[PDB]
Each structure stands twice: as C-alpha cells, then as structure tokens.
Amino acid sequence: SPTINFINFNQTGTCISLGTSKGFKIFNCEPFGKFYSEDSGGYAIVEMLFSTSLLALVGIGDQPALSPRRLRIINTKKHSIICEVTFPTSILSVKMNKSRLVVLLQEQIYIYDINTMRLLHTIETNPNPRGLMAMSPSVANSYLVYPSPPKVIKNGDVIVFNLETLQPTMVIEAHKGEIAAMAISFDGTLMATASDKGTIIRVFDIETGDKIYQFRRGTYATRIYSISFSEDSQYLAVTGSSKTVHIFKLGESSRHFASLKLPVETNSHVMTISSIGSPIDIDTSEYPEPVMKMVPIRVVSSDGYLYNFVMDPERGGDCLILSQYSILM
C-alpha cells in the first residue's frame, strides 16, 4: 500500500494526475479509468497539459535522479523524455497552459515558452513557503497570479502578471492576512482568493482589480485547501480542513449555496481537490432526489478515493453523493 503525495485535475477537469511513493498515475474522470501508470519512484508533483501526452514530474527524493530541484518533462504516448531543467531550491509548484510553463520556488518564479523551453523570465519573490499560485488555462487571457507579502499591514497583496508580454498588470489588495488559496477562471477572467483565516472568499476582476464577490465560509476560522471555478464561472468550489466542501454561486455578501459531505469513515485530516463539471441531465429514480439537469461535481481525497456528487442548480443545499472509486485499487 502506497502513500499519496499529490493529486490534481487537468485544466479541463476530465483527467486526474496523481503521484505516490511508488509511481504516478493518470485517470479519466468519466467514465472513470486508469489511463496511464508507472512504478518508477516517489513523486512530489505530477502535472498535466490538457489531454496532450506531455506531463511534468518532480521526484520526491528517494532517487539520485529525481531530486526535488529537478523538473522533468515526459511524453506518455512516446515514452520519451522531452526535457529536464534544474533549479537552485526545491520546486514547490508547476503550472501550464498551451503557451507557457511556470515553475514556482519559495522565492523565485520561472517562466518558459512551453514549445521551445526557452526561459523567458524570472521573478524574484518574497518567501512563498506554501507554493501558492494560479495560472490561466486560456492563452488569450494568459495571466499568472501569485501572493506578494512583505519581506519580514498589506499581508494579502496579490500580483497579477501578464505571461504573454511578461510584465505585471496590477496589485490587488486581496486580503489583510497571508494568502491561503487562489484560483483563476478558465477564461483568465476572474481571480478567487482566501486568506489563512478561511472565513471570507473574495472574487476579483483581473482587468479592473474590482472585488466582485465576497462569500462567508464557515463560522470559526479553518484552513482552506482548494478553490476552483466551474468553466462557465457560475459556481466556485472551496475545500478545507472541515471535511465539508462548499459551493458558492456567482449570480453584498453571501454564505454558501451548497455543500458536499464526504463520508464519516474517511480520516479527518485528509486534503481534497474538486472540480465542477458542465451540467447534465438525470432521471429522478435510481437516485431518490422526472429528468432534471444537475451540476456534477467531483471531489478526490488524499486517502485515495474519487467521489461523484450532483447539485440541484436551483435548490442548492446538501448535495447527494453519487459514487466513489479508488486509486491503486
């Protein structure tokens, strides 16, 4: 039985990247199935480009060849190695769209042309120990957002950086405290942020800097693990240490529009990621709660299961858990 170290969806929500102590795995979401697998060694980062065969790996450290300071770019259809780049400190994050690749270190950001692999720019950051950043999956609004703390008020400033021209566009005073999560809409239009107090979720317009939405999350401060826009930007999923997943609806303030309840059986210190899918149609029977259009949402947990929920786009509330599958069987 292997330990899970990393999980992510691809930019579309159709595939799952996963990295364990013994290899890495790649799944299709629906109909669920392993698409690729490898027993090489321990991995810390496994990141996809949308459904191309290119993926980026960083080994966790149980091998001389996969030090945490090394990005390796592989092709799964060719079984080839496109490239490898090394960095002065451990890699904390890797993000991609079809024009640029970004590697995130605690105090630097590296920005590459993804076809050439020519390094285009490097940003010197103040310490980002939590490896927080968000990158637009659309080339047309190709934006990267990353936290901008003071070098040890204004702890929750965020930098919006234009990847195409490699120049910063604005500073958003998003939060009063350290940033704890960030997401960017599929069209590179909106940004969503939360601070380490997880009480308030904010949504800004990238072009303006104008705060467009503010949601209250929970009552007492709890940690936030993830934020994700649905592709049409009408819903926003946030997961944190409460074992609850909250869905907020994007039309002063608002509490959450719906919630997902992961099974009581799961460990309570498990971290999760989610993605909200395009709506679909369901027959009433075979699922108590006659053909309504639900909104499907997927939640996958560190303990290694994928969960299928559906939300009622008009009534919200607590969402029904449709299904569950597992990784490494």
Residue-by-residue DSSP string for 94-151: EEE-SSEEEEEETTEEEEEETTT--EEEEEE-S--TT---EE-S-STT-EEEEE-PPP
For residues 17 and 37, the answer to whether their CB atoms sit within 8 Å is no
Q: How was this structure determined?
A: X-ray
Distances (CA, A) of 319 to 125, 287, 298, 310: 40, 12, 12, 6
Rounded distance between C-alpha atoms, residue 69 and residue 45, angstroms: 11
Long-range pairs for 90-94: beta carbons < 8 A, 24 or more residues apart: 91/44, 91/45, 91/58, 92/128, 92/130, 92/131, 93/45, 93/131, 93/132, 93/133, 94/45, 94/47, 94/56, 94/58
- For residue 288, whether the previous peptide bond is cis, meaning omega lies within 30 degrees of 0, is no
Rounded distance between C-alpha atoms, residue 219 and residue 56, angstroms: 38
For residues 43 and 58, the answer to whether their CB atoms sit within 8 Å is yes
Burial 132-148 (b: 16+ CB within 10 A, else e): bbbbbbbeebbbbbbbb
For residues 310 and 329, the answer to whether their CB atoms sit within 8 Å is no
Find the angle CA(103)-CA(104)-CA(108) to the nearest 5 degrees: 110
What DSSP line would sit under 189-223, residue for residue?
-EEEEEETT-SEEEEEETTT--EEEEEE--SS---
Number of helical (H) and strand (E) elements in the chain, helices listed first: 0, 31
CA dihedral 204, 206, 210, 212 (to 10 degrees): -30
Rounded distance between C-alpha atoms, residue 201 and residue 236, angstroms: 10
Rounded distance between C-alpha atoms, residue 183 and residue 236, angstroms: 9
Rounded distance between C-alpha atoms, residue 131 and residue 147, angstroms: 9
For residues 225 and 231, the answer to whether their CB atoms sit within 8 Å is no
Among 261, 127, 248, which Cα is nearest to 193's? 248
CB-count burial class (<10 Å; 0-12, 13-18, 19+) for 244: middle
Among 237, 241, 328, 306, which Cα is nearest to 276's? 237
For residues 51 and 12, the answer to whether their CB atoms sit within 8 Å is yes
**Locus of tokens 């899918």:** 277
Rounded distance between C-alpha atoms, residue 33 and residue 25, angstroms: 11
What DSSP line would sit under 215-267, residue for residue?
EE--SS---EEEEEE-TTSSEEEEEETTSEEEEEE----B--SEEEE--TTS-
Rounded distance between C-alpha atoms, residue 18 and residue 66, angstroms: 16
Rounded distance between C-alpha atoms, residue 186 and residue 143, angstroms: 11
Q: Across-strand partners of 216?
A: 200
Rounded distance between C-alpha atoms, residue 108 and residue 126, angstroms: 8
Number of compact structural domains in the chain: 1
Q: How far apart are the first and last CA of the chain?
A: 10
Tokens read off for 162: 């234009």
DSSP 77: T
* Residues 6 or more apart whose Cβ sits within 8 Å of residue 129: 106
CA dihedral 16, 119, 144, 235 (to 10 degrees): -20
Burial 60-98 (b: 16+ CB within 10 A, else e): beeeeebeebbbbbbebeeeeeeeebebeeebbbbbbbe
Rounded distance between C-alpha atoms, residue 236 and residue 200, angstroms: 13
Rounded distance between C-alpha atoms, residue 105 and residue 94, angstroms: 9
Final resolution, Å: 2.8
Four-residue CA torsion sign, 137, 139, 143, 144:
positive
CB-count burial class (<10 Å; 0-12, 13-18, 19+) for 215: buried
* Structural domain range at position 98: 1-329
Rounded distance between C-alpha atoms, residue 329 and residue 325, angstroms: 9
